[PDB]
Amino acid sequence: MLIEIHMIQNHSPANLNRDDLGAPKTCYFGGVLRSRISSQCIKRSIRTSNDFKALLLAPDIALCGRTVEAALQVAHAISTHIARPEIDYFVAADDVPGEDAGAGHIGESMFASACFYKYFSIDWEQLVKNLKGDTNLAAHTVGAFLLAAAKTNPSGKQNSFAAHNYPDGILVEFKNSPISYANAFVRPVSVVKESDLVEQSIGQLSNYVNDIRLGYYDEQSPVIGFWFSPNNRYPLGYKHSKLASRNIGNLNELVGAVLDYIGGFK
Amino acid sequence: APPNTLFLRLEGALQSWGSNEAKFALRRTADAPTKSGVLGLLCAAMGIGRAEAADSWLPKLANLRMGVRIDRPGIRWWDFHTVGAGQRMRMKTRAETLLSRREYLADASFLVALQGEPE
Amino acid sequence: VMYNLLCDNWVNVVYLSGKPDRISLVQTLKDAHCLQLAYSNPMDRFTVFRFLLALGYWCFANTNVEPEPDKPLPVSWIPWLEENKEYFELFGDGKRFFQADPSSRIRAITDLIHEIPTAHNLCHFKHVTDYIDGLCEACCIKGLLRLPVFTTVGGRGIGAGINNTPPFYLLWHANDLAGMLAQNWQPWDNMGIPAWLGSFQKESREVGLLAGMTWLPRKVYLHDPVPGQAACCSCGLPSEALVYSCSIEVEPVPKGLEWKDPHGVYTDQGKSLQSKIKLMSNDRYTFADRDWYSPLFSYLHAEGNSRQGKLWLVGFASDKAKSIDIWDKIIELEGTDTNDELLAQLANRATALNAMRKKPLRGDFKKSVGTPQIADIIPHAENRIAINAGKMTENRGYSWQDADTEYGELLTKVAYSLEPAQTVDARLKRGNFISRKPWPII
Amino acid sequence: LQKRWHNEPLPQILPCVMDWIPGYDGEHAPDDAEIHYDLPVSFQPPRHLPRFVIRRELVVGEDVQVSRETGTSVWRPKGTRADYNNSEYKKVRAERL
Ligand SMILES: [Zn+2]
């Protein structure tokens, strides 16, 4: 069996990932241009976090990489809407007066705000064979990664923009065949006065999950999923024949529920 | 009339079937799924390791006949990729950064037909 | 352990009946009408074909049998190759092929392979260490047949080969080895002394054909085979007789020497024009890949034209003692001699794209990056244009203004992101943004 | 061929890239057949061999029928409804009164 985490996270205007020219990294989807965060950036920011390291054959070598093959799988963070890069015109100042009101430096930097969709995958069999039959430590490191990935962000240009946002929707599912839900945002999300950017993204995710539940995923095997938003801020498919098996309003409760499903450990 | 061929749907947001002409820090790609790539996908789906693949599984599965139909060509998108930034790199070691540029296919879909033995 | 290459199966071939094989040299000369050279690295393919061309030149010189088009094989070459068995010899003392006197400078045998990292080269794409991995004898001959065309500078006290930095290499193509040889057949005046003879005491102002086309810029002496059980880390073939070390020595190239490879491309000053690819996209360079457009001016201006044919166009790019990239591209041509203004403009496409990307909408000077989002869509449009390189070069169905439409669809999607408002003014700036077409200038 | 959103157009000529088949009679491949280098043997010391590959094309509609998209839409917040004639509300108001 396989565990899959889908994540919706809006960010304040910043530049969390750059390239050789300073522009935010982008990609192409749905016929339009979307903002992107490269997968290795997310994996590095998760791995080298001090709070993560102070929390938990080594558990990081078992989960991540160094034939030791990692059970972790981080996909590129596509955006659920058309990218909107912007230029900020900065001017440096001199504290010493001169013959004119010169600057000292003149230039332009780039920034962009986006609502990213993140996909994660953990192979339970590879994880338990990596630690030679141990299960409690496997559940412990799964929970540690869940808290870390829920409470971390890249450090790119964070001394000037400080985009320390938090996720607004998490969906943890158990199934065999790996399918991601990037096809939900093939149509880019366009805002309306009666909703938010996060609300419409979560609703479109719910619509895609409903459509695929009515389709391929027959009664061969049930699919167990858990949906989390802080203090039940956003519902994924209100009623809708219980598209999500649970609705959670605290990170600890979701971590405990996933742990109790995977092994019943606490 | 038992079935004799298997169909693969290869469609994702980002795809990269690497080509033979990379050989260096310019990781290129091919326009279509290569035979070795889909063979490795099959062997990973069957739980066969790299060492175990070279004895019987790859010679057995190399006799099939393969054809790929293009549903969406996709767009080739590059990615600046640094390794070992703020950390040392292997070979003793060195405090240095490795630069590379990877290539992916974006918004592409392929259909793979692999005709062979019904079993 | 002698391992004569005339009888041992070392060259990897593919038969036109779909059967791959690993065959010898005599069999290659016998069935050059029904085989093709099978090598993943284009560099290895080019240098192997160069070695077969050199052997054909020597065989024609000493047998006086000129090869004919659309023929299986010029006869009596195989007995003549058999009369010289003692020369093309590997380890076992005596005369040794492409192998000079042993010395004290000992390096790992992977020194002569560019792709495999060694000697403070970072290992991230091939996990190996020096004096731990080994090479089979076929890969040893493959590495030995690389110095005169694909060597680079070293550190302090080590220079480069007879070609200075490795330039572009251009030559013709066919459907099989015999047709390839016949299409690429061109005898010279001064054959000279080939390096497999042994007498390297040239000391002459003029360099002969076989003297220079086999001009090894290093003195090497590879060691004896070592028993073991591993796989060669260049081809992966499971073998037990792996060699693990060699000895090297640098032979400096004397200045005031004239030697022109009849497959290369030179600048206006004869400065060994090199493929200009990188991986950084700096101020003076914008990454667009596939540097095929550069050497089709100098090669198509001095005796490199045969009207019809297929251009093979091996491209190896490096900067000082650091290999960057290697690629290849065939180009189909029929003739149709054209002017030089469009040829010169097409040959300078690298700086035309860099002017497109580096154009901002504000008043800063040249210390700027311009619009970086154009640089992301430039490689795809360049690759899509590159499908018709023959028509672009011959200018019979393609043109610069014909190719400007390929950016038109790509630039429509970028404008929706740079000017995302729904006002009239934003629509106007989006309309002006699609007009950004590259300008040819030299 | 499965279609995305209703406005989206479709490619008109679909290229197929297929392995060349000798048939034991046409022992020599045509000149358009090109060599790709993706026939594997091992993976840890990765080894490949070439193969002759040909490229043909298909016409959509004649060869592949365009499939129809599943029931889906862009998510919109529920604008509710409105109906008083409804008898259930006509009795709910009586209960309230
Ligand atoms: Zn080898």
Residue C34 in marked binding region: no
Distance from the alpha carbon of residue C39 to the mean position of ligand 1, in angstroms: 12
What would you report as the CA-atom Rg of chain D, rounded to the nearest whole angstrom? 30
Residue C123, annotated as binding a ligand: no
Instruction: Enumerate the H helices of C171-217 as residue ranges.
Output: 177-183, 209-213
Burial of A132 (0-12, 13-18, 19+ CB in 10 A): exposed
Residue B60 tokens read as 């057995």
Which stretch of DSSP H or E encloses residue A4? strand A2-10
Helices C372-385 and C406-418 cross at an angle (nearest 10°) of 160
Q: Residue D21: closest CA among chain B residues belongs to which residue? A: B65
Q: Tokens in use for C244?
A: 């693990």
Q: Are C181 and C70 in contact (CB under 8 A)?
A: no
- Smallest CA–CA distance, residue D35 to chain C, in Å, is 9
Interchain contact C88–B (C-beta under 8 A): no
Paired tokens of C247: 């000895």
Alpha carbon distance C301, C391 (integer Å):
17
Residue C387 gets which letter from DSSP? G
Gaps in chain B (C to N over 2.5 angstroms) fall after: 91
State the Cα–Cα distance between residues A136 and C145, nearest whole angstrom.
Answer: 58
What SS3 class is residue D59? strand
Do B67 and D51 lie within an 8 Å CB cutoff?
no
In sequence order, what are the residues at sequence separation of 6 or more whose Cβ sits closer than 8 angstroms to the Cβ of residue A72?
A43, A63, A64, A65, A120, A121, A122, A145
Q: What element of type H or E holds B83? A: strand B75-83
Give distance in angstroms: CA of C231 to centre of ligand 1.
8
Given a contact cutoff of 8 angstroms between Cβ atoms, the answer to whether A99 and A114 are in contact is no
Q: Which residues of chain A does D4 touch, with a Cβ-Cβ cutoff of 8 Å? A: 186
A130 Cα: distance to centroid of ligand 1 (angstroms):
33
Q: Where are the beta strands (DSSP E) in C125-237?
A: 218-222, 226-231
Contacts of D81 by beta carbon, 8 Å cutoff, 6+ apart: none
Rounded to a whole number of angstroms, the distance from the CA of A208 to the nearest CA of chain D is: 8
Q: Which residues in chain C are closer than 8 Å to A82, comparing Cβ atoms?
A: 416-417, 420
Name every residue whose Cβ is closer than 8 Å to that of residue C243 and which is 6 or more positions away in sequence.
Answer: C109, C134, C135, C137, C140, C222, C223, C224, C225, C226
Rounded to the nearest angstrom, the distance between the alpha carbon of C143 and the centre of ligand 1 is 10
Buried b (16+ CB within 10 A) or exposed e, A233-264: ebbbbeeeeebbeebbeebeebbebbbeebee
Which of these, A212, A202, A180, A184, lies nearest to A247 by C-alpha position? Answer: A202
* Total CB pairs under 8 A between chain B and C: 57
Cβ–Cβ < 8 Å for C173, C21: no
Residues A23 and C51: their CA atoms lie apart, in Å, by: 48
Q: Do D45 and C233 touch (CB under 8 A)?
A: yes
Q: What's CA C282's distance to the chain center, in Å? A: 25
Q: CA torsion sign, A13 to A18 to A24 to A28?
A: negative
Label each residue of A86-106 as H, E or C: EEEEEEECCCCCCCCCCCCEE
Distance B57 CA to ligand 1 centre (A): 23
8 A C-beta contact, residue C78 and residue C30? yes
Q: Rounded CA gap, A182 and A118, in Å? A: 9
Q: Which of A25, A29, A38 sits opposite B106 (nearest CB)?
A: A29
How was this entry determined?
cryo-EM
Strand order in the sheet with C245-250: C106-108, C245-250, C218-222
Q: How far apart are CA D48 and CA D33, in angstroms?
A: 19
Is B62 touching C (CB cutoff 8 A)?
no
DSSP calls for C300-356: GGTT---SSEEE--EEEEE-SS-EEEEEE--EEE------SHHHHHHHTHHHHHHHH
Burial class (CB in 10 A: 0-12, 13-18, 19+), A46: buried
Strand B98-115 with B5-15, pairing: antiparallel
Contacting chains of A (3 CB pairs or more, <8 Å) are B, C, D
C417 touches chain A (CB under 8 A): yes
Tokens representing residue A161 in the block: 């923009």
Instruction: Name the residue facing A203 among D8, D44, D75 (closest C-beta).
Output: D75
CB contact under 8 A, B13 and A19: no
Query: Within an 8 Å CB–CB cutoff, is residue D48 touching chain C?
Result: yes
CA pair distance A162, A231, nearest whole angstrom? 24
Beta bridge partners of C315: C327
What does the radius of gyration of chain A's CA atoms come to, in whole angstroms?
21
Comparing CB atoms, the residue among C364, C372, C413 nearest residue A33 is C413
Q: What is the DSSP string of D64-96?
A: BPPBPPPS------------SS-HHHHHHHHHH
Measured in angstroms, the CA of B35 and the nearest CA of chain D are apart by 6
Question: How many residues appear in chain B?
Answer: 119
- Largest CA-CA distance found in chain D, in angstroms, rounded: 93
Angstrom distance (rounded) from CA A188 to CA A17: 21
The SS3 of residue C228 is strand
Strand B98-115 relative to strand B65-72, pairing: antiparallel
**Burial class of residue C284, CB neighbours in 10 A (0-12, 13-18, 19+):** exposed
Rounded to a whole number of angstroms, the distance from the CA of D76 to the nearest CA of chain B is 24
Chains that touch B (3 or more CB pairs under 8 A): A, C, D
C142: three-class secondary structure by DSSP: helix
Contacts of C368 in chain A (CB under 8 A): 107-108
Is C232 annotated in a binding site? The answer is yes
**Closest of C380, C377, C279, C281 to residue C323, by C-alpha:** C279
Question: 3-state DSSP call for residue C123?
Answer: coil
Backbone angles phi, psi at A212, to 5 degrees: -75, -25
B19, B23, D52: which is closest to C315 by C-alpha? B23
What are residue A74's DSSP bridge partners? A120
Between CA A94 and CA D44 the distance in angstroms is 59
The answer to whether C328 and C315 are in contact (CB under 8 A) is yes
C-beta of residue C300 within 8 angstroms of C-beta of residue C393 = yes
Q: Are C231 and D28 in contact (CB < 8 Å)?
A: no
Cβ neighbours of A19 in B, within 8 Å: 80
Q: Which residues share a beta bridge with D52?
A: D35
For C3, half-sphere exposure in the C-beta direction (CA atoms, 13 angstrom radius) is 22
How far apart, in whole angstroms, are the C-alpha atoms of residue C95 and residue C84?
Answer: 12
Q: Does D80 touch chain A (CB under 8 A)?
A: no
Q: Tell me the C-alpha distance between A170 and A151, whole Å.
A: 12
Contacts of B107 in chain A (CB under 8 A): 28-31
Backbone angles phi, psi at A34, to 5 degrees: -115, 155
**Is C280's Cβ below 8 Å from some Cβ in A?**
yes
Torsion of CA A242, A248, A253, A256, to 10 degrees: 30
The chain C residue lying nearest D38, using CA atoms, is C40
Q: Rounded to an integer, what distance in angstroms lies between the CA atom of residue C374 and that of residue C415?
A: 10
Q: Please tell me which of the candidates C280, C282, C417 has its beta carbon nearest to residue A85.
A: C417
With CB atoms and an 8 Å threshold, state whether A26 touches C420: no
What distance lies between CA C186 and its chain's CA centroid?
20
What angle do helix axes C424-434 and C406-418 make, rounded to 10 degrees? 150
Resolution for this PDB entry, in angstroms: 3.4
Q: How far does the centroid of ligand 1 lie from the alpha carbon of residue A90, in Å?
A: 56
Q: Is the dihedral of CA C41, C44, C49, C52 positive or negative?
A: negative
In angstroms, the CA C111 to CA C118 distance is 6
Rounded distance between C-alpha atoms, residue A138 and residue A259, angstroms: 10
Backbone dihedral region for residue C48 (phi beyond 0: left; psi -120 to 50: alpha; all else: beta): alpha
Token duo for residue A72: 């972790």
Phi, psi of C290 (to 5 degrees): 60, 75
Among all chains, which residue has been given the structure tokens 């930034």?
B85
Question: Cα(C64)–Cα(A140) distance, rounded to whole angstroms?
Answer: 80
The answer for residues whose C-beta is within 8 angstroms of residue A86's C-beta and 6 or more apart is A13, A110, A111, A112
Cβ–Cβ contact D27 with C under 8 A: yes
CA-based Rg of chain B, rounded to a whole angstrom? 18
CA B119 – CA A115 distance, rounded (Å): 47
Determine how β-strand C314-318 pairs with β-strand A169-175: unpaired
> Helical H runs in chain A?
39-47, 50-55, 59-63, 124-130, 136-150, 197-213, 251-262
CA A174 to chain centre: 17
The subunits that touch chain C, with at least 3 C-beta pairs less than 8 Å apart, are: A, B, D
